[PDB]
Amino acid sequence: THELQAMKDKIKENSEKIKVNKTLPYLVSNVIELLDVDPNDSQRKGKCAVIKTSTRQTYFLPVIGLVDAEKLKPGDLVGVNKDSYLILETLPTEYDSRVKAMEVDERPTEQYSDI
């Protein structure tokens, strides 16, 4: 009954490996989502997912990895590093620079009551 702290240590050591291999979000990407399982023709199980890249490429991957089909139908910014090709987290949101915010100002510094 005292092995719960030992399992807490192995999930702390392996989540420390989740701290070094999340696997880190770096390259920006986009998603394509689907559900699949393989009967043959023996029987096995699993699921697959698709992805976009910043380099325009696309990949066919067993389901993410890390976060799951929980969300979403394909969005933006799904964290993946290079050959790992797994999606750890989906970070909000959108785009872009001044296209994002045309002008964001405090407000006009005077009130219409003058004119």
């Binding site: 719960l4 399992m7 807490k8 192995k10 999930i11 392996n14 989540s15 490996k17 989740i18 291999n21 696997t23 394509i32 689907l34 699949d36 393989d38 043959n40 023709d41 697959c48 997912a49 698709v50 992805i51 325009r56 490429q57 696309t58 990949y59 066919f60 991957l61 067993p62 993410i64 990895g65 890390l66 139908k73 394909p74 050959d83 790992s84 090709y85 797994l86």
Partner: protein, 353 residues
């Protein structure tokens, strides 16, 4: 504690790299199959040992290994835009009766669209070919966009709206292919229906050719033609078209086939505007004093939204006094006077057919 380790064991499956998407092009031998990457290099690789080429076929979306590039797994069909054009929803249905006029605009479009779906036998009973599409135009009066929007959630069955904007696709405006990419699922999900607003600015003339951005336009038109020029039967898709004017489209579209029927809207009659105010006067409650024909006889030659919005604006102009219920008095003034300002810009609204 145990579920966290399960997510750890989940992560013990994730170090395996994801494969590369592929399209099997054709084949050569059982160890050699023509395949290309999405970036253009063509390869010939071996398969895995579970599959038969009957599970592959040429021209098939597949996947390859990341090193050996061997054929392993696959999915036949995928795309981004399709389902995300579906999700626009119109209240009604009952918005059918909430467009006011007009019968032969209302009723005929039911015979133009609905009956083709349910009873194609009634087409072959007489022997007439099914109309595969429809066309609106304007804007004398108005409602081309809502009557569409209404019928979508009214007619039910399967319908997919086409947003007319983003097609240009910035770099490499080849996206006319996406219409086939959309038509492919329109041949899959069939039957399905398509509304199109703004076919005119994508209806570019190339009359006297100039610069660059016109060339990508006219090229995006050539596929729309050829898609309807098939070589194919699109009958299970219903193409609905409306825009500012039915003029610039060039004669290729203007013929049947591409443009199946001629439907439009004009200035709704004051008799039909008498009904257009009811659906405006329904959601607004006031003191019980009303003469519908008063506003109908005072306010003349308007549109459903033009009436309503100003009629609600009149209620908003009348509620400026902070009192709650308002008799038509303010409205026989506001809607009268306010739309007079609104009819100043009614200028030059009369467009060719």
């Amino acid at each position: 504690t145990k579920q966290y380790e399960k997510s750890e064991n989940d992560l013990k499956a994730l170090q395996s790299v994801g494969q590369i998407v592929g399209e099997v092009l054709k084949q050569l031998t059982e160890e050699k199959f023509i395949v290309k990457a999405t970036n253009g290099p063509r390869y010939v690789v071996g398969c895995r040992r579970q599959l038969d080429k009957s599970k592959l076929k040429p021209g098939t979306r597949v996947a390859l290994d990341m090193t050996t590039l061997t054929i392993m797994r696959y999915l036949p069909r995928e795309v981004d835009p399709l389902v995300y054009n579906m999700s626009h929803e119109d209240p009604g249905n009952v918005s059918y009766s909430e467009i006011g006029g007009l019968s032969e605009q209302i009723r005929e479009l039911r015979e133009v669209i609905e009956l083709p779906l349910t009873n194609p036998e009634l087409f072959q009973r007489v022997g007439i070919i099914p109309p595969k599409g429809c066309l609106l135009y304007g804007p004398p009066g108005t409602g081309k966009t809502l009557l569409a929007r209404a019928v979508a959630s009214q007619l039910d069955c399967n319908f997919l709206k086409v947003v007319s904007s983003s097609i240009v696709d910035k770099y490499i405006g080849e996206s006319a292919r996406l219409i086939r990419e959309m038509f492919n699922y329109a041949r899959d999900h069939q039957p399905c229906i398509i509304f199109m607003d703004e076919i005119d600015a994508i209806g570019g003339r190339r009359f006297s050719e100039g610069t660059s951005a016109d060339r990508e336009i006219q090229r995006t038109l050539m596929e729309l033609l050829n898609q309807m020029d098939g070589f194919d039967t699109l009958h299970r898709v219903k193409m609905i078209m409306a825009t500012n004017r039915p003029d610039t489209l060039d004669p290729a579209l203007l013929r049947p086939g591409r443009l199946d029927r001629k439907i439009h809207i004009d200035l709704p009659n004051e008799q039909a505007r008498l009904d257009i105010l009811k659906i405006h006067a329904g959601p607004i409650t006031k003191h019980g004093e009303i003469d519908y024909e008063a506003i109908v006889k005072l306010s003349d030659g308007f549109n459903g939204a033009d009436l309503r919005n100003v009629c609600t604006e009149a209620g908003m102009f009348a509620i400026r006094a902070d009192h709650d219920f308002v008799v038509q008095e303010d409205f026989m003034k506001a809607v009268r006077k306010v739309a007079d300002s609104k009819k100043l810009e009614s200028k030059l609204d009369y467009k060719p057919v």
